[PDB]
Design a protein around this ligand. Structure first.
Ligand code: HEM
Ligand SMILES: O=C1N[C@@H](Cc2c[nH]c3ccccc23)C(=O)N[C@H]1Cc1ccc(O)cc1
Length: 394
């Protein structure tokens, strides 16, 4: 006898397990057990993943309900699971989007200058260089301090909450509450700081004193700063790091993008499509009995939308494991989700990766791993798949 199939399958972000294609072909919706011991429905085909993400009766908000089957323990207060919904209800959605667009004056130049300075420092120090700790993550942190309008010197401390805040744990994490409360106090101070007049926090500070937003809570304003810094920095730093591995493992593509940097945006879209940065399926709780393929999902059950299940589906993306720059449906992947909860930082994440890759290929055209690929150490029980260090030479 064997136990019910457990998720996640592997923390490695450099290869997709053969099990994904097996489940997609044989049982594209099937029962699994999560790290908490709960049962869930794992969805692995493009058609069924899109159906779940486009039906709001599969609720993100309701995954925080007490007594629900859980993918993992909350690392934020339960109301914060519905963060975007709370922002929209407060009439702040348009202002938040305008603040996080990569089109802001001087933002792209700031990204280029920061990426170039980090790379120059690595070249001065000499090989090996760690592209996660000394490139991708500081570039993501610097970008988010600029987008938020907060001091660059405050970035490293806010960043150090992330290795705990984005854990995917069976049980509550005491350190996550200590760091959450401290980071909220910091953002509350930023709202009261007269020097903070630019970026997302400068805009929220002004809207907070506008009569049209007098009843929006101070708790929500501080929460927007903590959540957008954390989600943006963990997502951009982790995606860029794993996209750099995908590129280093494809020297023909690396050489083509070095030669023709105008192809970098199409290259980043394929790197997003094949990305294995999300460690778990996206969770949703059914609020009704809903038919998904051969399964009638019952009200109160947990559904997990496996992004790599959809993104590597050959019925939607033929030769799914290959980076092809001329696909006819290039942005139809689910790397940023789909539907009600589609990533609000999609344009900024694309620009962060495009500029980081453009700068790296110009400065280090001979970039290569400095250790055999199996020697990368993959972070476990985390909401993202990332190597602890990414040692390279050039
Ligand atoms: C490469 C970069 C990024 C990737 C791959 C990524 C991916 C995703 C995905 C897949 C979702 C959907 C989650 C779901 O439906 O359960 C999401 C949501 C979200 N992301 Fe991103 N993200 C990235 C960058 C960012 C950035 C830069 C920010 C903010 C500065 C951000 C803020 C958020 C927030 C707040 C949500 C929740 C939206 C909602 O509930 O409506 N993301 N992201
Ligand atoms: O469940 C998630 N799902 C995805 C999407 C998401 C869902 N709800 C969110 C609220 C705020 C920011 C992001 C989200 C994610 O990026 N993060 C986590 C939420 C999160 C946010 C901030 C933390 O310190 C810890 C956890």
């Amino acid at each position: 006898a064997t136990v019910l199939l457990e998720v996640p399958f592997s923390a490695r972000g450099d290869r997709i397990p053969d099990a994904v294609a097996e489940l997609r072909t044989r049982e594209p919706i099937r029962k699994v057990r999560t790290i908490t011991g709960a049962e869930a429905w794992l969805v692995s085909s493009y058609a069924l993943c899109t159906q779940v993400l486009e039906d709001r009766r599969f609720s993100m908000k309701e995954t925080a309900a007490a007594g629900a089957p859980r993918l993992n323990a909350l690392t934020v207060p339960p109301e914060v699971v519905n963060n975007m919904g709370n922002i929209a209800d407060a009439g702040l959605r348009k202002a938040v989007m305008k603040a996080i667009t990569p089109k802001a004056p001087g933002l792209e130049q700031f990204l280029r200058d920061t990426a170039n300075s980090l790379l120059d420092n690595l070249i001065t120090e000499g090989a090996p260089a760690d592209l996660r700790n000394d490139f991708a993550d500081p570039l993501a942190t610097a970008l988010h301090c600029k987008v938020l309008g907060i001091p660059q010197e405050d970035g490293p401390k806010l960043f150090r909450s992330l290795s705990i805040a984005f854990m995917s744990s069976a049980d509550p994490i005491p350190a996550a509450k200590i760091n959450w409360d401290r980071d909220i106090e910091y953002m509350a101070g930023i709202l009261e700081n007269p020097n903070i007049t630019t970026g997302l926090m400068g805009e929220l500070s002004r809207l907070r004193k506008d009569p049209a937003y007098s009843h929006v809570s101070d708790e929500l304003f501080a929460t927007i700063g903590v959540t957008f810094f954390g989600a943006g920095v963990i997502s951009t730093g982790s995606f860029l790091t794993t996209a750099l591995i995908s590129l280093i493992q494809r020297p023909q593509l690396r050489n083509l993008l070095h030669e023709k940097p105008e192809l970098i945006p199409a290259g980043v879209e394929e790197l997003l499509r094949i990305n294995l940065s999300f460690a778990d399926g996206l969770p949703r709780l059914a609020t009704a009995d809903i038919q998904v393929g051969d399964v009638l999902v019952r009200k109160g059950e947990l559904v997990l939308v496996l992004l790599e299940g959809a993104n590597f589906d050959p019925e939607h993306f033929p030769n799914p494991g290959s980076i092809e720059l001329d696909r006819p449906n290039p942005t139809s992947h689910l790397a940023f989700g789909r539907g009600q909860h589609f990533c609000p930082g999609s344009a900024l994440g694309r620009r962060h990766a495009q500029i980081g890759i453009e700068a790296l290929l110009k400065k280090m055209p001979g970039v290569d791993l400095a250790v055999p690929i199996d020697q990368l150490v993959w972070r476990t029980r985390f909401q993202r798949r990332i190597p602890e260090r990414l040692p390279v030479l050039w």
